[PDB]
Amino acid sequence: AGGKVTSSTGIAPKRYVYYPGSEELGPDEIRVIACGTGMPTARRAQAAAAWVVELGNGDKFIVDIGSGSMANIQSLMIPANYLTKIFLTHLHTDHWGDLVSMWAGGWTAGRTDPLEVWGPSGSREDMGTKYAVEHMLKAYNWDYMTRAVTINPRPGDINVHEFDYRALNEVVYQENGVTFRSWPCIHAGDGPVSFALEWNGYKVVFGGDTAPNIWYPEYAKGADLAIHECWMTSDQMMTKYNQPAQLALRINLDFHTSAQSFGQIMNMVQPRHAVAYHFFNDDDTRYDIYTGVRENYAGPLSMATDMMVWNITRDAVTERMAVSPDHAWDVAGPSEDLAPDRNRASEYTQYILDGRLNVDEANAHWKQEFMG
Amino acid sequence: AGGKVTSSTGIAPKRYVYYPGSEELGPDEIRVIACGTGMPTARRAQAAAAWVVELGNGDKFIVDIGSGSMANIQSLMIPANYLTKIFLTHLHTDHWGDLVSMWAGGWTAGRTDPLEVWGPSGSREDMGTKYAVEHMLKAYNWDYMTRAVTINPRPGDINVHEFDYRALNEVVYQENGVTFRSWPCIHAGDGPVSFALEWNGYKVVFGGDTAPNIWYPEYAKGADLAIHECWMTSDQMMTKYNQPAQLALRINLDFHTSAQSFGQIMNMVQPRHAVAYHFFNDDDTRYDIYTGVRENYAGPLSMATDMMVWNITRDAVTERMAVSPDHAWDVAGPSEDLAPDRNRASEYTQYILDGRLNVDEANAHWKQEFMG
Amino acid sequence: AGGKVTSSTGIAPKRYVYYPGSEELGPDEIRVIACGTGMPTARRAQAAAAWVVELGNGDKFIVDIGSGSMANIQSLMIPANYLTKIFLTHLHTDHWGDLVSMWAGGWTAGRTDPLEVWGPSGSREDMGTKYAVEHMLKAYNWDYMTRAVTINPRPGDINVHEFDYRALNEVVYQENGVTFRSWPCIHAGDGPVSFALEWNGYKVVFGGDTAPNIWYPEYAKGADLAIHECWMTSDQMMTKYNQPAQLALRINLDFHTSAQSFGQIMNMVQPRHAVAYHFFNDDDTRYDIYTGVRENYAGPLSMATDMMVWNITRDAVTERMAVSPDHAWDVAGPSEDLAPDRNRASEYTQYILDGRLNVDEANAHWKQEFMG
Amino acid sequence: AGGKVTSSTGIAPKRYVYYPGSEELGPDEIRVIACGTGMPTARRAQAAAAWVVELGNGDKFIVDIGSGSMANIQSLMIPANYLTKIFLTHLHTDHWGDLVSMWAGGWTAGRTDPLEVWGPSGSREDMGTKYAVEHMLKAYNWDYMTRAVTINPRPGDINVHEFDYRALNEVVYQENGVTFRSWPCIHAGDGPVSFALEWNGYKVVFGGDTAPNIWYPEYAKGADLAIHECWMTSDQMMTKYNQPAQLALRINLDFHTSAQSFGQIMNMVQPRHAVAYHFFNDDDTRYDIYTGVRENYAGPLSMATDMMVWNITRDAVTERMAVSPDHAWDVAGPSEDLAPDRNRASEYTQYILDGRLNVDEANAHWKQEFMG
Ligand SMILES: [Zn+2]
Ligand SMILES: [Zn+2]
Ligand SMILES: [Zn+2]
Ligand SMILES: [Zn+2]
Ligand SMILES: [Zn+2]
Ligand SMILES: [Zn+2]
Ligand SMILES: [Zn+2]
Ligand SMILES: [Zn+2]
């Protein structure tokens, strides 16, 4: 498996797994990594929805950042200043839960620009991304104010770009030859959308969560890589969540897209490669779901799980697994100093500061040796 | 290792590893489970700070619920109805970022009561826990309002019991034989605290985070299990983060509790069992840290890592590892069918519901089999 | 998922995963664990062929013991003395490579009786199991003679029971109500067999390796669990091993059991549950293999991987995953240590023993402590 | 951690973890990878002893290849043809058990030269390496003869280079500027040795198994990297193995090198870097072991676990962890395909070949698509 090794001290070429940080991206390539593929129920094996998209022009995007995903994203050895741009298909906790962790973690880890978030309005102010993000920041104001005492705060801001959820395949981002468009989904209530990213001839479709709708088939047409929700079977709804037969049946018809519906939709879309996700990918779930999709779609397919990666070039769409460090550490980028802000009041009172215990004796040993 | 196996078809007794869900609790026993031991920087091997405490009387508590920790908590096979009470030492994202995830995932998973959260206050309203949780609930307002359309809102509420962060060893909860007391910490700004849980003649202390202070050695005195921050060394600060010397030296004296200070602190407390946590536990960091500690403390000592477990009994404090499923699933409890509040208006508009794709034909085949 | 949890302090019942050591086996139940499911090529995710069978009368067998399987087998927390009987289907390294590690490690793990091994003859003496095992013992002469000086050597014998490979469904074992029959396979050269195991109404078939043959369909009919080889596709052969199309094609017609053949065979067998094994079980191989099998067979099917477990009952064959410890240990049994025979030659010379380093000093301190 | 990333589309330099196959080895550099560090008891976390050594001139060696190590070795993505040279410290199963798996597996994976094995003599013929490997090949004669029908048999040979175990730091290998030397150990009986590899001013010492002895401290002196056995504590011996107090005490005195002894030894040796191995490396064992060593040794130290890697250069010896695929595959090297031999009698008799099942019908669908 992999490319043929040509030399003893050389590098293994065309490696059968993706090792994050070890492969150059070419000018006419896209790399998409599934950093979370699962549910609102947590599990170590699948974080919640998150995709990282790296373009050969050097731009990098996050689409969705669900609870748990930060640990996958941080294992990619991408410096935090390259991952400042985040798109949210909707405001379920399992699609934006780890935004806080990107915001706060990315900032101790040396981001120097503000985060930029694109996401959808709702049917009124208090159901859209602008309201959501603004209150999150208040939610974590203790965290914000104490951190800002010691680190310039400009990177701790979040610039939100709220776009109209109702719009039909309209542009919501356009920069440096890259376009994002959105269109709506039908999912729990008004707000959710799907994105399409266009760049240098490629189209990548990030479906989000949805019951089957008429817009995705139209606007995802011809994607190089098309991602869509694909639910666990009604038989698995009974075994796993002990649901009555009637409610089990409805889930795969009213509330969610079934594997059979996914098959029809990808049959319509005709992409170079489809990707089913948002189901628990276990040894006793995955096969029936595959078979349901194959009822109606015959083309290249990926059954998504965490750390799956696609390389999109002219000639091919290649699925591999990424093998990344469990004991991850932040990795530094080329960015430099921002001089801390002198105009920040301490959030300590003298009362607390008087509580300090004397520990000079116990530390004098290591403290002495270290000062060489 | 473990108890002598005596039967061919029986059950291995007193197992060398803890299998969650497999052992009964007994009326004089406490079980403490580290569900996160890490840093604000995320990592598959270490979720951020979380602790689960199950008591002999059937009571359960989460102390801290940092980002990523839910996946570990979920692998315990404890029904969502039994973990409704959560205690926060401080408002840093790595000590309550997964609250939203408990709140949202638990509610979907049939939790029937509201979550209950105790946390400190700050030097003013916008720096304390009641303000944080209030704005957290607004942050996830879309999620709340849409889920509340098909599920009774009562489990979606969160009752916040704020307490004065300045109080010295005062009682903050008192129920069913169980007491918690708080005292202050010295950590980034006013607000952060430690807890001591007292029950049935047991005392268990949760340090949260702090620089060494005079309050912990006093009020933690003779704990069965005492938990305190223990930071990485200054040589490791220079190697892992590329800190210059002066700054690395100070991280361990002014901002954080060094291993040498932790030992001193535990030499004072004289507990049954001491736990160091809040450092990246790796094959190249851990040993120098345990050796800084032993300089000043020689009692029993745990170097915590995720899914480590302590059994408190009269005879001993026993450390084991937990071996849980990575492919976790929610596990049902006793609690009943609490019905939808049918007055709740839908959150869809007709403009969205109007885009449903027709998928009758595609689903006809499996619809028919499942019905018959 | 799993069974309804009924008390805070008690035990979760009918658990969705099998924790080895934590469940009783009932007088009318079979438990089959896959301890290896892989190939002649090694891999942490899949050891080579090995099967553990625990019967409700308290009998235990290993059918095959391929290279790498001991780590999985030793995670079952089964005492070494319960695992003395071993059936080999054939003599490829991936089916008996770990015999020696059972022999040696098991002996130090406690085993007190001889290992006992059943396996087939070949077309001449030097192609059979007696020759094989006897020469393996000579290969490890040094380890055996040196270990025997210190102990009674009885547990280091291996008694081999060779049976004719040509025989059609004849009994090779019959003890305590358990029967085993064998019949032939077509696989590399004369000698490999498949086993049927019968006890208390149940029938479990261990197919081993084989190109498709007339004996399996006949003698495997009506098995509770039928295990058979099921190969990787010809596309995957060209993709992963760079086979030119012609050779890739015949790999699936001449030499191995194709997925479609597997389906045809299990079609004729009509087991309660069929098991496919012996392929690399990766996110990018298993779907085309499953689909191959479903062309021709629609009864219950398992796609094996390591640590899969089947519980067999009158009412059901249930598939679970086992969750067992990676940091496994020797677990002590009832078996009691027997008296040696003061009559074996030492294997040291004095030239060697006169090289001992004087370490008295460096060991004095911890010595002093330990004599408490 | 790691080098600073300089570009969006570029490769992370000096990565904080080692991804096998991804790094060029410099002309004046050695890379040593621990592919097993455990015991004769099997465990997923710790294969039995195995070291892979890669030199900057393109030469590679395996020192020990114990049970279970092959899965780790195979994850390194080195073509079988580059790892034909194997050095055995001694003839315990946990040091050469997986030799049969290198032999068979690498042959079916396009190794085209014979394996070359160096190992010690014993006090008489039947306690040496030559005898041992001769009988290992006979033990697996069914596998050997059936394979040589279809694959050229040359690479199925093992040339054994036996050397005198008694020799005191004498060359046993010399080639292309690379020297291995051996000296005796005291372990179980006469035969075991330790090795030193010398090349290009570097010295790496592979301890093997031994009670403390006068030879290692003298001949390992000034090693760039030195490896020695470091046994579990006597207390851990009573907890984990239930050894009575006196038995547990002599184990660390007469039979093994205690951690305190390790430390004295390394204090004499003064290696640029020391490495302890051959203990179960667990959260509840490692710490006291490390404390043991530091009683007497203060220099750089690693506590070996599986997939740890050392880079040795002129400036530094760096420890890192290797992160490699669990789902491993053979990778092909540059070599010339070896044509078989037709003068090889089949190992099939017609009696078995007459048993083939016809499967043209079940296979006709996929057959047709695949041929076009
Ligand atoms: Zn959603
Ligand atoms: Zn979702
Ligand atoms: Zn904090
Ligand atoms: Zn913290
Ligand atoms: Zn075979
Ligand atoms: Zn095989
Ligand atoms: Zn040995
Ligand atoms: Zn050994």
Short mmCIF file of N, CA, C and O in Angstrom, two decimals, chain D residues 262-347:
data_model
loop_
_atom_site.label_atom_id
_atom_site.label_comp_id
_atom_site.label_asym_id
_atom_site.label_seq_id
_atom_site.Cartn_x
_atom_site.Cartn_y
_atom_site.Cartn_z
N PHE D 262 20.11 -0.27 38.23
CA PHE D 262 20.12 0.44 36.92
C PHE D 262 20.84 1.72 37.08
O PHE D 262 21.76 2.08 36.32
N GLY D 263 20.41 2.47 38.09
CA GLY D 263 21.05 3.77 38.37
C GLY D 263 22.54 3.74 38.66
O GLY D 263 23.28 4.59 38.20
N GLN D 264 23.01 2.76 39.42
CA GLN D 264 24.46 2.61 39.68
C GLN D 264 25.12 2.34 38.38
O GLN D 264 26.05 3.06 38.00
N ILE D 265 24.65 1.30 37.68
CA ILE D 265 25.20 0.99 36.35
C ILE D 265 25.35 2.21 35.46
O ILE D 265 26.44 2.53 35.04
N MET D 266 24.26 2.95 35.25
CA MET D 266 24.31 4.15 34.41
C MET D 266 25.16 5.24 34.98
O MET D 266 25.78 6.06 34.20
N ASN D 267 25.23 5.31 36.31
CA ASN D 267 26.22 6.25 36.91
C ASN D 267 27.67 5.96 36.48
O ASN D 267 28.41 6.87 36.13
N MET D 268 28.04 4.69 36.44
CA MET D 268 29.36 4.24 35.93
C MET D 268 29.52 4.52 34.45
O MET D 268 30.55 5.07 34.00
N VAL D 269 28.48 4.18 33.68
CA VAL D 269 28.54 4.29 32.23
C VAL D 269 28.65 5.70 31.71
O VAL D 269 29.42 5.96 30.75
N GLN D 270 27.88 6.61 32.32
CA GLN D 270 27.82 8.01 31.90
C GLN D 270 27.43 8.13 30.42
O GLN D 270 28.19 8.68 29.62
N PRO D 271 26.25 7.62 30.05
CA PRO D 271 25.84 7.66 28.64
C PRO D 271 25.44 9.08 28.25
O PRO D 271 25.10 9.83 29.12
N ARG D 272 25.50 9.50 27.00
CA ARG D 272 24.85 10.77 26.66
C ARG D 272 23.37 10.66 27.01
O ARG D 272 22.72 11.65 27.39
N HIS D 273 22.80 9.47 26.88
CA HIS D 273 21.37 9.26 27.22
C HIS D 273 21.09 7.85 27.66
O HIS D 273 21.58 6.92 27.05
N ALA D 274 20.37 7.65 28.75
CA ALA D 274 20.10 6.32 29.24
C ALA D 274 18.64 5.92 29.04
O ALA D 274 17.75 6.76 28.96
N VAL D 275 18.40 4.63 28.94
CA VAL D 275 17.06 4.13 28.64
C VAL D 275 16.83 2.92 29.44
O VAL D 275 17.58 2.00 29.36
N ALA D 276 15.75 2.93 30.20
CA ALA D 276 15.32 1.79 30.97
C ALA D 276 14.16 1.14 30.30
O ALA D 276 13.25 1.82 29.85
N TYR D 277 14.10 -0.18 30.31
CA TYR D 277 12.98 -0.88 29.68
C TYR D 277 12.75 -2.18 30.38
O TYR D 277 13.48 -2.53 31.29
N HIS D 278 11.77 -2.93 29.86
CA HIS D 278 11.44 -4.32 30.25
C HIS D 278 10.67 -4.39 31.54
O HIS D 278 10.73 -5.36 32.29
N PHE D 279 9.91 -3.35 31.78
CA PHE D 279 8.89 -3.37 32.83
C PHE D 279 7.52 -2.93 32.27
O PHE D 279 7.43 -2.21 31.23
N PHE D 280 6.45 -3.35 32.95
CA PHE D 280 5.13 -2.89 32.60
C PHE D 280 5.03 -1.43 32.97
O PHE D 280 5.17 -1.05 34.17
N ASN D 281 4.88 -0.60 31.92
CA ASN D 281 4.96 0.84 32.06
C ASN D 281 3.54 1.40 32.18
O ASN D 281 2.89 1.69 31.16
N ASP D 282 3.08 1.50 33.43
CA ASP D 282 1.72 1.86 33.80
C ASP D 282 1.73 3.00 34.80
O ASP D 282 2.68 3.13 35.59
N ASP D 283 0.66 3.79 34.77
CA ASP D 283 0.40 4.86 35.75
C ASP D 283 0.72 4.52 37.24
O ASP D 283 1.12 5.40 37.99
N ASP D 284 0.54 3.26 37.65
CA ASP D 284 0.77 2.86 39.06
C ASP D 284 2.07 2.08 39.29
O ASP D 284 2.24 1.52 40.37
N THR D 285 2.93 2.00 38.28
CA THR D 285 4.23 1.31 38.44
C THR D 285 5.42 2.23 38.18
O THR D 285 6.46 2.13 38.87
N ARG D 286 5.26 3.12 37.18
CA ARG D 286 6.41 3.82 36.58
C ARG D 286 7.11 4.71 37.58
O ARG D 286 8.33 4.83 37.56
N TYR D 287 6.32 5.35 38.43
CA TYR D 287 6.86 6.45 39.23
C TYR D 287 7.90 5.99 40.23
O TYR D 287 8.97 6.59 40.35
N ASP D 288 7.62 4.89 40.91
CA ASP D 288 8.55 4.40 41.89
C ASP D 288 9.79 3.86 41.26
O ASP D 288 10.88 4.00 41.83
N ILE D 289 9.62 3.26 40.08
CA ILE D 289 10.74 2.81 39.29
C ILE D 289 11.64 3.95 38.96
O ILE D 289 12.85 3.84 39.14
N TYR D 290 11.06 5.04 38.47
CA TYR D 290 11.89 6.19 38.14
C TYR D 290 12.61 6.67 39.40
O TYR D 290 13.75 7.11 39.32
N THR D 291 11.92 6.62 40.55
CA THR D 291 12.49 7.16 41.81
C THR D 291 13.69 6.25 42.15
O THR D 291 14.77 6.68 42.44
N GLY D 292 13.47 4.97 42.04
CA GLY D 292 14.56 4.01 42.13
C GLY D 292 15.82 4.39 41.39
O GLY D 292 16.92 4.19 41.91
N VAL D 293 15.71 4.88 40.15
CA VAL D 293 16.90 5.09 39.33
C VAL D 293 17.56 6.33 39.79
O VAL D 293 18.80 6.39 39.89
N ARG D 294 16.77 7.36 39.99
CA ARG D 294 17.33 8.67 40.38
C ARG D 294 18.04 8.64 41.78
O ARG D 294 18.81 9.52 42.05
N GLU D 295 17.80 7.62 42.63
CA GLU D 295 18.65 7.44 43.86
C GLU D 295 20.13 7.53 43.51
O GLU D 295 20.89 8.12 44.25
N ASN D 296 20.51 7.00 42.35
CA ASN D 296 21.90 6.90 41.96
C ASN D 296 22.33 7.45 40.62
O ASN D 296 23.51 7.68 40.46
N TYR D 297 21.39 7.65 39.67
CA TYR D 297 21.68 8.19 38.33
C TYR D 297 20.94 9.49 38.07
O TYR D 297 19.72 9.54 38.13
N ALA D 298 21.67 10.52 37.66
CA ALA D 298 21.07 11.86 37.51
C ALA D 298 21.07 12.36 36.07
O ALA D 298 20.71 13.51 35.82
N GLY D 299 21.47 11.51 35.13
CA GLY D 299 21.71 12.00 33.76
C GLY D 299 20.44 11.87 32.92
O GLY D 299 19.41 11.40 33.43
N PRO D 300 20.51 12.26 31.63
CA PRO D 300 19.29 12.07 30.84
C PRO D 300 18.83 10.61 30.76
O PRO D 300 19.64 9.70 30.65
N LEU D 301 17.52 10.43 30.85
CA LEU D 301 16.88 9.18 31.03
C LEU D 301 15.56 9.17 30.31
O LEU D 301 14.87 10.19 30.30
N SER D 302 15.19 8.00 29.76
CA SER D 302 13.88 7.74 29.17
C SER D 302 13.36 6.52 29.82
O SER D 302 14.10 5.59 30.05
N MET D 303 12.06 6.47 30.06
CA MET D 303 11.40 5.26 30.60
C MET D 303 10.68 4.63 29.45
O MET D 303 9.65 5.10 29.06
N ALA D 304 11.25 3.59 28.85
CA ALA D 304 10.80 3.16 27.55
C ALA D 304 9.36 2.68 27.60
O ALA D 304 8.90 2.14 28.60
N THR D 305 8.64 3.03 26.56
CA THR D 305 7.40 2.41 26.21
C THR D 305 7.37 2.22 24.67
O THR D 305 8.29 2.70 23.95
N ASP D 306 6.40 1.44 24.19
CA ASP D 306 6.29 1.07 22.80
C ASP D 306 6.19 2.31 21.90
O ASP D 306 5.54 3.26 22.27
N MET D 307 6.93 2.29 20.78
CA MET D 307 6.97 3.37 19.79
C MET D 307 7.63 4.62 20.25
O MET D 307 7.43 5.67 19.71
N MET D 308 8.48 4.52 21.24
CA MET D 308 9.32 5.66 21.59
C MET D 308 10.46 5.69 20.59
O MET D 308 10.89 4.62 20.20
N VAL D 309 10.94 6.87 20.19
CA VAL D 309 12.05 7.00 19.27
C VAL D 309 13.09 8.00 19.71
O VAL D 309 12.77 9.06 20.30
N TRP D 310 14.34 7.62 19.50
CA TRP D 310 15.48 8.47 19.74
C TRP D 310 16.17 8.87 18.45
O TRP D 310 16.48 8.01 17.63
N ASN D 311 16.39 10.16 18.27
CA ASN D 311 17.28 10.66 17.23
C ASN D 311 18.61 11.00 17.87
O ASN D 311 18.65 11.79 18.83
N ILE D 312 19.66 10.37 17.37
CA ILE D 312 21.01 10.66 17.82
C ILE D 312 21.80 11.44 16.74
O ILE D 312 22.02 10.91 15.64
N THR D 313 22.19 12.67 17.06
CA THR D 313 23.03 13.52 16.23
C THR D 313 24.25 13.95 17.07
O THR D 313 24.43 13.55 18.26
N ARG D 314 25.11 14.75 16.43
CA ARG D 314 26.31 15.30 17.06
C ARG D 314 25.98 16.18 18.22
O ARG D 314 26.66 16.10 19.25
N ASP D 315 24.91 16.96 18.07
CA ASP D 315 24.46 17.89 19.15
C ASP D 315 23.62 17.32 20.28
O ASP D 315 23.60 17.88 21.37
N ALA D 316 22.88 16.25 20.01
CA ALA D 316 21.80 15.91 20.88
C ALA D 316 21.30 14.48 20.69
O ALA D 316 21.42 13.91 19.63
N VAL D 317 20.73 13.93 21.74
CA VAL D 317 19.92 12.74 21.69
C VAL D 317 18.54 13.16 22.12
O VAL D 317 18.32 13.55 23.26
N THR D 318 17.61 13.12 21.19
CA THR D 318 16.23 13.55 21.40
C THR D 318 15.27 12.37 21.49
O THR D 318 15.29 11.50 20.64
N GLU D 319 14.41 12.39 22.49
CA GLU D 319 13.37 11.40 22.69
C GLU D 319 12.13 11.97 22.11
O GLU D 319 11.88 13.13 22.30
N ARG D 320 11.36 11.18 21.35
CA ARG D 320 10.01 11.61 20.89
C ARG D 320 9.15 10.38 20.88
O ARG D 320 9.70 9.27 21.04
N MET D 321 7.84 10.54 20.67
CA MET D 321 6.95 9.38 20.48
C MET D 321 6.65 9.26 19.01
O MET D 321 6.51 10.25 18.36
N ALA D 322 6.60 8.03 18.49
CA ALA D 322 6.22 7.74 17.14
C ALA D 322 4.73 7.57 17.10
O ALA D 322 4.16 6.96 17.98
N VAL D 323 4.09 8.14 16.08
CA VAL D 323 2.66 8.06 15.92
C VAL D 323 2.45 7.40 14.58
O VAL D 323 2.71 7.96 13.50
N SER D 324 1.90 6.21 14.62
CA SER D 324 1.95 5.40 13.42
C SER D 324 0.65 4.64 13.21
O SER D 324 -0.17 4.55 14.12
N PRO D 325 0.45 4.08 12.02
CA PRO D 325 -0.88 3.58 11.78
C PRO D 325 -1.13 2.24 12.44
O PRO D 325 -0.23 1.38 12.45
N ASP D 326 -2.26 2.16 13.13
CA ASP D 326 -2.78 0.92 13.74
C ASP D 326 -3.32 -0.03 12.72
O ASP D 326 -3.33 -1.24 12.95
N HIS D 327 -3.87 0.54 11.66
CA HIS D 327 -4.29 -0.21 10.50
C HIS D 327 -3.10 -0.18 9.53
O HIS D 327 -3.13 0.53 8.53
N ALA D 328 -2.04 -0.93 9.85
CA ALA D 328 -0.80 -0.93 9.00
C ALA D 328 -0.90 -1.81 7.70
O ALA D 328 -1.65 -2.80 7.67
N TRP D 329 -0.15 -1.45 6.65
CA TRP D 329 -0.06 -2.30 5.41
C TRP D 329 1.41 -2.38 5.06
O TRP D 329 2.18 -1.46 5.38
N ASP D 330 1.78 -3.45 4.37
CA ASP D 330 3.10 -3.56 3.76
C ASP D 330 3.27 -2.41 2.77
O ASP D 330 2.30 -1.98 2.12
N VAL D 331 4.49 -1.91 2.68
CA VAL D 331 4.86 -0.89 1.73
C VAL D 331 5.95 -1.58 0.89
O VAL D 331 6.73 -2.36 1.42
N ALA D 332 5.93 -1.35 -0.43
CA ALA D 332 6.87 -1.97 -1.36
C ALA D 332 8.08 -1.09 -1.48
O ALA D 332 7.97 0.15 -1.39
N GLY D 333 9.22 -1.75 -1.72
CA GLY D 333 10.53 -1.12 -1.84
C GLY D 333 10.94 -1.20 -3.29
O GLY D 333 10.12 -1.54 -4.13
N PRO D 334 12.21 -0.90 -3.60
CA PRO D 334 12.60 -0.76 -5.01
C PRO D 334 12.82 -2.09 -5.79
O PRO D 334 12.87 -2.09 -7.03
N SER D 335 12.90 -3.21 -5.07
CA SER D 335 13.52 -4.44 -5.59
C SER D 335 12.96 -5.03 -6.87
O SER D 335 11.83 -4.74 -7.29
N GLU D 336 13.77 -5.91 -7.43
CA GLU D 336 13.41 -6.75 -8.57
C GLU D 336 12.55 -7.95 -8.15
O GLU D 336 12.96 -8.78 -7.32
N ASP D 337 11.33 -7.99 -8.70
CA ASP D 337 10.46 -9.17 -8.67
C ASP D 337 11.32 -10.42 -8.88
O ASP D 337 12.15 -10.46 -9.78
N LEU D 338 11.12 -11.42 -8.02
CA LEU D 338 11.82 -12.71 -8.16
C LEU D 338 10.91 -13.76 -8.82
O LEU D 338 9.83 -14.07 -8.31
N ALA D 339 11.36 -14.29 -9.95
CA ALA D 339 10.61 -15.31 -10.68
C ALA D 339 10.67 -16.63 -9.91
O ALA D 339 11.74 -16.97 -9.39
N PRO D 340 9.54 -17.37 -9.80
CA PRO D 340 9.49 -18.66 -9.09
C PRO D 340 10.37 -19.78 -9.67
O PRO D 340 11.31 -19.51 -10.42
N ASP D 341 10.07 -21.01 -9.28
CA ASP D 341 10.70 -22.21 -9.84
C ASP D 341 9.58 -23.18 -10.21
O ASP D 341 8.69 -23.42 -9.39
N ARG D 342 9.63 -23.73 -11.43
CA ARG D 342 8.63 -24.70 -11.90
C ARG D 342 9.01 -26.17 -11.58
O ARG D 342 8.17 -27.07 -11.64
N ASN D 343 10.27 -26.41 -11.20
CA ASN D 343 10.72 -27.74 -10.73
C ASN D 343 10.21 -28.08 -9.32
O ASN D 343 10.86 -28.86 -8.60
N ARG D 344 9.09 -27.50 -8.91
CA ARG D 344 8.61 -27.67 -7.54
C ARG D 344 7.29 -28.44 -7.56
O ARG D 344 6.23 -27.97 -8.06
N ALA D 345 7.38 -29.63 -7.00
CA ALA D 345 6.24 -30.48 -6.88
C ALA D 345 5.20 -29.77 -6.03
O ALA D 345 5.54 -29.15 -5.01
N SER D 346 3.96 -29.83 -6.50
CA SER D 346 2.83 -29.32 -5.78
C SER D 346 2.70 -30.04 -4.45
O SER D 346 3.20 -31.12 -4.29
N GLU D 347 2.05 -29.42 -3.47
CA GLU D 347 1.74 -30.08 -2.20
C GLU D 347 0.25 -30.43 -2.11
O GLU D 347 -0.25 -30.89 -1.10
#
